[PDB]
Write a protein that binds this ligand. Structure first.
Ligand SMILES: NC(=O)c1ccc[n+]([C@@H]2O[C@H](COP(=O)([O-])OP(=O)(O)OC[C@H]3O[C@@H](n4cnc5c(N)ncnc54)[C@H](O)[C@@H]3O)[C@@H](O)[C@H]2O)c1
Ligand SMILES: [Mg+2]
Ligand SMILES: [Mg+2]
Ligand SMILES: [Mg+2]
Ligand SMILES: [Mg+2]
Ligand code: NA
Ligand code: NA
Ligand code: NA
Ligand code: NA
Lengths: 494, 494, 494, 494
């Protein structure tokens, strides 16, 4: 049961958030954010740059000073605040889901039942961790008492993408705040609105001024200002592999701040001959097409055993042809438009490359509408490992189906990639499942399912898909500093 | 590759071990220990009673005094001592394996390749834990610094059975010593020899006097004296459910000492129709017959799906008929004699009980030799849940095979038992394996295998099979006391 | 800011709670609960006995069946339910604090700002643990995949005392429900009201019928029925050392159910010569007199260094003389009446004993009013270790002041006790603090403070003060069963 | 008791170690390693460069292949191998200590009693961790079974400095090998010998070929090749802050390999007026002068409270003047030469800068011998924060003594640094110790002691002193990859 959406939600926040106050950019400049379903400008938003980042960093540093309200606050109380924030987001769920759809393009039904639900679950999960991430008392040699304190890392710069605006903001705020850090967040230029509204809720929840600061703006300006800042202790980045390299170099060239990266992928989804056919087809469809194909862990290489290849393909094509593309506010819409014009064109370019290289176009392949950035659900069959569409992240509704024969063969082909974010295996056999989950070089391996995320389970990639993890207890590590205190004692006893 | 055994190993230790020295019982009484393969007395052993236990507890208490060598010793050094003990045991491996077989009856090849290997692995595993079981620093509300110290419980009474003499001794000493406790061990009257020789190695390894004290003797005397002692802080017991009750009652009626119990079982081994037949038959045989059937976790209820029942039974009977029973020092021997006359008679009684209640005797069913306590591998078919042989622990070479139709049905039947030590499932299906491992109410569930123990994995029972665990990190909990220290500080900061 | 109390709160719940419904006792019998401030009957409460306990256990067992709503519920949702209960309790905070004061006797200001605050913080802390108590994946030897599942123990019997009705209920429900167990709680006959009202909130919060069942009644009847029940998996008991022994014996004599105990103490509060005089005096007063002296961890052995003894005593006597005893609903009242006539007489008897044995009566020593169970704040000086009042738990407003000379002396005297629940050290010296905190044999050692509890920090005693812990992560151990699942795999790799 | 050293130990290993074999550099080029006590060449060593690093990486990658002996080896066995390596190093303890002193310059007595002892303790500690670093089973929402596997990161490049040759190699190999990774180590050009001999012991211990590969050579050649290698998964660097930046940039510019840095510091050692004078003076001396002042965590900023400044300085000067500088093989020698000519000159330059900026030269200040690189123990008084010697790491026998008045003041001055490796506090006061340990921004804070390291306690820096940690359980995090496996199950239950 989904409440009727306001297809034209009002925008209340569109400025820079610092010290719980709204500010215009120092330059007074603004940039437009577009509704991808219509191609029309929603509103103007303050264009933050270096000077604005500097103001935000100083406010974060001030809020992080020893003896400040945020530093003195009981850990259990930080949890109370995260829970309060969640309650506020839930109060405004119908509104936020509509705003998310308007700015991003994803179906309102999904924004409401999925994105918003996950935001709530993630913040409430981390609220619980606030007073539970213990340090240790260590039995070192000699007459000493030794223990560790798990202290906050400090001023954390967080740069997020546009595919899951509210969820990415929650994935970053949750562990950072639970562990007592202060934040300077740079939201994506394509989707800054929902995050800004949440900042209003952060203030309402009672978080001390300076604890969370949000600077909307571009990458080479605001984003780079955060990465190269001399007083930013750590930077968490989620986005393209290309910018990930830029971020790591900026950190090494500035103050050696700590860096964590969540990059893209070209995740293999392996269908063994003994899989449940109906289930495997629907899951492989979901694996690739979810969120207009704009998922880092999208199952973009669908490997199907030869004995079931023909039937699997035939059913996959039928499902892709039946997928409803249209107005994201319409309850029947399964697929909305791509996020912007740049992405829209990039996808069309990859489709053209697929055709040129000899992949078999089975359905779709072009624009789905005259207005907005809509693309038809596209399926390529007989894809080979050396093809561009089999190697590069398309980030669109373009499915690649490859044929294989043996389990030893598919392991090697699946692993022959510079990416290692996720992978999946569909089979009824115990031994095959264990053999594959162990052998696949990926941060997450799903068995008989796909895109199953939980605030409790970590999500991080291997190889060039990034470093470190998000969600779960592991997510707390990157936001913690370890201090060992070793005290001389009169006579140590067990 | 097994070294030739000395079939008549000399006995060097047969007294009470206290403060690293050998003592006769205060009464000067001795008891004979019998070789179960011949029915002849090996030698006499000091018969410890209450007064001897009192001496041992006082020695253990003195060695646990604050400032003592054992209390001041670095945790890493306790690990060094455990590793040294393991090296000494390995040096005398061939001798210990033969002495184990002489007093217990198990095949020398098994004593050498299994028992001794597992003793070495247990001690070395625990040596590694000595300096890694950390306490915690806790983010409590207010201006305080709060942390916990993981201290030793103190004087630990350990009462062990006779089925795995050396191994049970190691399972008890490993975690207790790794955490800095002191021990008063009461070994089984049927198999005291190997543990007394290890005491000699404990002294040789460098353990301070009083850290380990061993008192051979009977149960209602020496064992009860430990359970009811006013200065024993904890008692660990492994044996019959019946004596487990007496122990817990003795603890409650004396000084409320902490108690952990490892009792018996009637473990269900479930063979689904899609299982690997050959593997399942051999493993089911091993699951029940291992160690002359004297295993707490013996797969004494073999449930077989109806479609493969006939074939499974036919193959199980052939395997049981081919099992070689004889002199345990002979390399061809698969099964030695039962531990003693009492058990021998108990098993014969159970065999007769099975015949009387209508179970189908398929093979064996009688005495296998003139001398010693040898029983023929026995298999009962068409066993029903309400039969006594399907409910009570026989602890002998007597197999029960039951027929079932569905997975839902077998779950209920397998769980309808007052015991819950272990269980197993043989199937090739992923979902059946996961459905069963979750649904089975047992401490350990094996999938496509049986009796697979690792020093790293915990082992404990559910229901009336006991409480607490042994092996792994979990085995350290019962040997640790948690002290919280909460300090007022000028101003608490994250 | 404390809201004006309803000095005569209406009673809405006074029956047996089973399956989210109210029931009279099978016998139809009821017992009166008295207001300790007036000595008058508040109302009648159903008198649960064995047959009632039998009904509650059956309800709990049914609610725990595999596939039930409580068993299938996501761990995170158990957390949501606990947070909801907390919210309901906060909504009815004013009412609950008043009802607590009416049935128990403690000052309403304290019930509201201390007890209710702690109930909320306990339930909210444990709600956060629901989905965070992980099992392990273990690198066992050989070609196997081994892991542990932390499952609920099952039907947990919880018998609680009268000193902190609401808090004791929270301390028990929090960890038990966070881990998915079902409960059959037997509240104290002296204070059954507030717990019964919370049962109504449990139902309102949405917990499935049978998850929490409450049986008001007497000890030897309802309490013993739970301890000896054949289908209760675990029993947690908080109360007298005497009954603790009965519980452990009942468990061993019945079904070997798991047992944890929290008994009394005779906690030493050590004031060194360099301590802050003013702080130490107020804290020692608090340590002993808090909650009408009805605390298990009361600092009932105040050790004071000779050089500051005279001054400390002088100041301690003045503070005791100024302590306001009267109507608990009056904002000026610091000390309410003792819980009942039995306790009232026991305390007066101890005071007589103190005078007979030569302790120096410095103030108080008699009845404080002709109505209710009020006792004057009493202080005994020059107390010696061998005195009855220095060894036995008085549980009243009777303070013992002892003189000592050296640090080695005080450590031994503090440790020369059958109890070991808590201890405290007041000093400005680093080394003295560390020397004492390590040497004192107590579950909790406070430094420059007393009675500092946090939901995050564990609380459990040493020696005869109990076994196991409550609060913190450690509290989850006793409510968890560990299952090892070991699966044969094709080829294990790191 | 230290065995008499061989003052001219023979060199057995001086080549590149790959696949358990010795190779000359592909270019055939060699470089001389100098004895810092005489200034003479000890021997030539193969000069590894990019091509050699390429061979090492291929060897490491081949040893890491799924199905390889190293990958299939039981975790417990990796522990056995580390323990065996430790035994071999202990067998050759006397020789190794001598060789260390010959190549490095530190006193032989220290090499034997400190360095070798810590190497043994480090390796044995990590051997224990091999089969104890568990993954987790997670209670995620929905009908799924989710767990994590802690897998090795893979090919780890390790670049180490010259101050503690053997210990640095151990600190690196211990955690890397315990977690199943493979190594390509680049030892310091100034001290390559001991590491190369240990490589021989690694082969003897039984480690599979290619698990550990050592490439002696220069930094911009061999070092940079590892940091920029496309097939190196992680790089761990210990050294100058300047090269740390180079490493991080090379990583971001190459394959986004994971990076951990262990840089220098300017650690504050704070002496409060209530400190034990004699203890504080000796410890402050040790803090700074240890290992020729060549310690990253050297107490190079000795803050002394004004009331005790004069006496402290006076006593410090006396101690520095009596410190014996000479032949490291002579038992009376407390300080040997500096590692090389470059360091020797840099230190002399800093002493010159100290005199020029107005620091009061109290003793020493020049060359201590005609031969080798010996420098007189130098002490500067009245040092100000803005001085060069007060800000830059000198890495020599040059002590800075600063005066302060208040605790609040020293906290600010101590923290006003770009570094944050360590700090110390000398005081008898409990509150002062807790106030400072919390307030100091450093990875390690010692209280009434200095340079207290334990294999159990983690060691890592804050700010520009590095990221990540070494030693303890924390040291395993950087060498582990986390894989999440999420499996669809029929019906999840608690
Ligand atoms: N859990 C097991 O691994 C295990 C082991 C051996 C036997 N059992 C079961 O026990 C049945 C009977 O064998 P048992 O008589 O040798 O077992 P048991 O319980 O009597 O003896 C085991 C240990 O406890 C000591 N003990 C005996 N009476 C005692 C007492 N009153 N107080 C304290 N300690 C006492 C024994 O001397 C021995 O050391 C077997 O047939 C089998 O079913 C179980
Ligand atoms: Mg870009
Ligand atoms: Mg018996
Ligand atoms: Mg009573
Ligand atoms: Mg350099
Ligand atoms: Na937009
Ligand atoms: Na025997
Ligand atoms: Na009452
Ligand atoms: Na050198």
């Amino acid at each position: 049961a989904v409440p009727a959406p306001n297809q034209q939600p009002e925008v209340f926040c569109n400025q820079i958030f610092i010290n719980n106050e709204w500010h215009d950019a120092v330059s007074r400049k603004t940039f437009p954010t577009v509704n991808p379903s219509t191609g029309e400008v929603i509103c103007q938003v303050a264009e933050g740059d270096k000077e604005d980042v500097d103001k935000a960093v100083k406010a974060a540093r001030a809020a992080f000073q020893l003896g400040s309200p945020w530093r003195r606050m009981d850990a259990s109380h930080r949890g109370r605040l995260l829970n309060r924030l969640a309650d506020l987001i839930e109060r405004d769920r119908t509104y936020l889901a509509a705003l998310e759809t308007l700015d991003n393009g994803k179906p309102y039904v999904i924004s409401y039942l999925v994105d918003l639900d996950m935001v709530l679950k993630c913040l409430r999960y981390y609220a619980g961790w606030a007073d539970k991430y213990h340090g240790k008392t260590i039995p070192i040699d000699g007459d000493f008492f030794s223990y560790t304190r798990h202290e906050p890392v400090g001023v954390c710069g967080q740069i997020i993408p546009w595919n899951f605006p509210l969820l990415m903001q929650a994935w970053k705020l949750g562990p950072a705040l639970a562990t007592g850090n202060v934040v300077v967040m740079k939201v994506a230029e394509q989707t800054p609105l929902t995050a800004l509204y949440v900042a209003n809720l952060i203030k309402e929840a009672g978080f001390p001024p300076g604890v969370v600061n949000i600077v909307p703006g571009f990458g080479p300006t605001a984003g780079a200002a955060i990465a190269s800042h001399e007083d930013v202790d750590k930077v968490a980045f989620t986005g393209s592999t290309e910018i990930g390299r830029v971020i790591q170099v900026a950190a090494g060239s500035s103050n050696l701040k700590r860096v964590t990266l969540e990059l893209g992928g070209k995740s293999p989804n392996i269908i063994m001959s003994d899989a449940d056919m109906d289930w495997a087809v629907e899951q492989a469809h979901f694996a690739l097409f979810f969120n207009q194909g704009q998922c880092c862990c999208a199952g973009s290489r669908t490997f199907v055993q030869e004995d079931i290849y023909d039937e699997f393909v035939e059913r996959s094509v039928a499902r892709a042809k039946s997928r409803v593309v249209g107005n994201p506010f319409d309850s029947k819409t399964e697929q909305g438009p791509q996020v912007d014009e740049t992405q829209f064109k990039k996808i069309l370019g990859y489709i053209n490359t697929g055709k040129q290289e000899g992949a078999k176009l089975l359905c779709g392949g072009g624009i789905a509408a005259d207005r907005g950035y809509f693309i038809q659900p596209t399926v390529f069959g007989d894809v080979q490992d050396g093809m561009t569409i089999a190697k590069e992240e398309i980030f669109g509704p373009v499915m690649q189906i490859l044929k294989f024969k043996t389990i030893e063969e598919v392991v090697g082909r699946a692993n022959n990639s510079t990416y290692g974010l996720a992978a999946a295996v569909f089979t009824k056999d115990l031994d095959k499942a264990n053999y594959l989950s162990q052998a696949l070089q990926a941060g997450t391996v799903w068995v008989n399912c796909y895109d199953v995320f939980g605030a409790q389970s970590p999500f991080g990639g291997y190889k060039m898909s990034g470093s470190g993890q998000e969600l779960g207890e592991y997510g707390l590590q990157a936001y913690t500093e370890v201090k060992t205190v070793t005290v001389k004692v009169p006579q140590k006893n067990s």
